[PDB]
RNA sequence: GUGCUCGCUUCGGCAGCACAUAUACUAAAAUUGGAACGAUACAGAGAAGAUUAGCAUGGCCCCUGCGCAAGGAUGACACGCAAAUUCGUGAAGCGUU
């Protein structure tokens, strides 16, 4: 019954599931780089990026 | 530069005439930028359970190939809270002309 519910719920394949996780990881690394850049601008250190 | 001048006129010089008439992306440089795999960590291969052949499609994505062949993971990407013009009924409660 548990496998029945878990397979009646699913519609997504491999690539959609890796892209959703990749979007969450991109959001996480964006917030992390945002925090680092906000600290570098808050204390004041003008390191430029590429 | 050379030759000819019944040129001065010596073998020294000068004069005249003739022929000959415009190289070089100008550097042995100074500069200026974008770039070599590939190593560093991470990262993991589509199709509604799982294991999988693939053929396409589109373009500010390319690589290998002489290729209008064929490969590159079906080469990669594409996965979207997929909302575009324009509304009306019926009673019910409350306030108003
Ligand atoms: Mg599958
Ligand atoms: Mg092919
Ligand atoms: Mg395959
Ligand atoms: Mg293809």
3-state SS, chain A, equals CHHHHHHHHCCCCHHHHHHHHHHHHHHHHHHHHHHHHHHHHHHHCCCCCC
Dihedral pair phi/psi, residue A5, rounded to 5°: -70, -40
**Residue tagged 């600290």 (tokens):** A39
Which technique?
cryo-EM
Distance CA A29, CA A25 (A): 6
Residue A22, CA: closest nucleotide via C1'? B43
User: Environment class of residue A10 by beta-carbon count within 10 Å: exposed (0-12), middle (13-18) or buried (19+)?
Assistant: exposed
Nucleotides of B under 7 A from a protein CB: 44-49, 77-80
Helices (H) and strands (E) in chain A, counts: 2, 0
CB closer than 7 A to strand B: which residues? Answer: A 7, 10-16, 18-20
């Amino acid at each position: 019954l548990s496998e029945a519910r878990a397979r009646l719920a699913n519609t997504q394949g491999k690539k959609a599931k890796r892209k959703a996780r990749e979007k969450q990881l991109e959001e996480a690394r964006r917030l992390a780089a945002l925090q680092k850049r906000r600290e570098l601008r808050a204390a004041g250190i003008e390191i430029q990026k590429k």
